[PDB]
Write an enzyme that holds these catalytic residues in place. Structure first.
Site, PDB file in Angstrom:
ATOM      1  N   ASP A  24      13.111  25.938 -14.490  1.00 24.19           N
ATOM      2  CA  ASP A  24      11.886  25.456 -15.123  1.00 24.19           C
ATOM      3  C   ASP A  24      10.953  26.636 -15.374  1.00 24.19           C
ATOM      4  OD1 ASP A  24       9.694  24.149 -16.012  1.00 24.19           O
ATOM      5  OD2 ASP A  24       9.170  23.220 -14.086  1.00 24.19           O
ATOM      6  N   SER A  55       2.811  30.810 -31.781  1.00 29.33           N
ATOM      7  CA  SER A  55       3.639  30.664 -32.961  1.00 29.33           C
ATOM      8  C   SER A  55       2.802  30.885 -34.216  1.00 29.33           C
ATOM      9  CB  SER A  55       4.280  29.270 -32.964  1.00 29.33           C
ATOM     10  OG  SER A  55       4.978  29.012 -34.173  1.00 29.33           O
TER      11      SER A  55
END
Length: 330
Positions: free
Chosen positions: A35, A199
């Site tokens: 994770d 992004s």
């Protein structure tokens, strides 16, 4: 040193991925959910409340000659999905794919919430976010990657998650045969303890690319892609019959649909998520309403590049002094 371990979807939807991990002496192999959105290595154990264990493999520290109680240390964690677990702490030897760390904090669960009990395939979590998020008190502990870093050939790990197929976590090296083209690296902020990056924009299907900054986290422990409501609405508007359902808890779409791809930007590069990766199947067994793999982050407080996004790429988690993330197509 290096390590390399295969990671395998737990079910036909790729809801999560498990990777075998050796703990203790003699080894006890548990299948852990790696994770990159959390920083605790915790396991089902001989100390877990018996009614909360239902098929998981447990770690028994009393059977490990290298286990030592970390005196006074406790842990307690709550995840974005509302699940939680807590317990005490041992140090022990932990190996992943041939890479060994001695003295790793192994957080032994005394209590787990129902969603963990109900998932017999996940024996615990192995956190790979920054150690500043580790919950051990009163002395915070380091992640497996943080402990291994100095010994690694290169201070990196990579995630290569499969679509309906096994994939690979590598530690200490970049397998140049595992991706196509080049790797585009992008800046990371560690201020929130995550692999947080920006992004450069998105496209829906064959549509034009929209240049816009989307700050979010690379999180292998989250199944879906959570993005701003504007972006998600633009995606689902291209799917006939798709709608946001308050009763179901997100966007649903007709199971008869063919979904468009979703592209996200990494600098000037582009990662394309095929439409099929966005189908999470019937909302309930036999339903013709299917659950979407792209969902709004509006209620979370952060955008999450979960498995839906990451499995479309070869992803480098670069733990150099200034960390960065790398993405390649594959």
């Amino acid at each position: 040193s290096t390590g390399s371990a295969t990671t395998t979807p737990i079910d036909s939807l790729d809801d999560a991925y498990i990777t075998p991990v050796q703990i203790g002496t003699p080894a006890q192999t548990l299948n852990l959910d790696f994770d990159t959105g959390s920083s605790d290595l915790w396991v089902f154990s001989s100390e877990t409340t018996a009614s909360e264990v239902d098929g998981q493999t447990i770690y028994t520290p009393s059977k490990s000659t290298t286990a030592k109680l970390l005196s006074g240390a406790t842990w307690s964690i709550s995840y974005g999905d509302g699940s939680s677990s807590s317990g005490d702490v041992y140090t022990d030897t932990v190996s992943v794919g041939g890479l060994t760390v001695t003295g790793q904090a192994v957080e032994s669960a005394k209590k787990v919430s129902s969603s963990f009990t109900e998932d017999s395939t996940i024996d615990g979590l192995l956190g790979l976010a920054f150690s500043t998020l580790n919950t051990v008190s009163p002395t915070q502990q380091k992640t497996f990657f943080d402990n291994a870093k100095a010994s690694l050939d290169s201070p990196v790990f990579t995630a290569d998650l499969g679509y309906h197929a096994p994939g690979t976590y590598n530690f200490g090296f970049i397998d140049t045969t595992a991706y196509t083209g080049s790797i585009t690296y992008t800046a990371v902020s560690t201020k929130q303890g995550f692999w947080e990056w920006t992004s450069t924009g998105y496209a829906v299907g064959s549509g034009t690319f929209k240049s816009t900054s989307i700050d979010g986290i690379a999180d292998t422990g989250t199944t879906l892609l959570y993005l701003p409501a504007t972006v998600v609405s633009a995606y689902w508007a291209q799917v006939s019959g798709a709608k946001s359902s308050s009763s179901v808890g997100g966007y649903v779409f007709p199971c008869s649909a063919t979904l468009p791809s979703f592209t996200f930007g990494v600098g000037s590069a582009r990662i394309v998520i095929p439409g099929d990766y966005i189908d999470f199947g019937p909302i309930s067994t036999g339903s013709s309403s299917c659950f979407g793999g792209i969902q709004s982050s509006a209620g979370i407080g952060i955008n999450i590049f979960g498995d839906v996004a990451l499995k479309a790429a070869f992803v480098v988690f670069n733990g150099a002094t200034t960390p960065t993330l790398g993405f390649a197509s594959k």
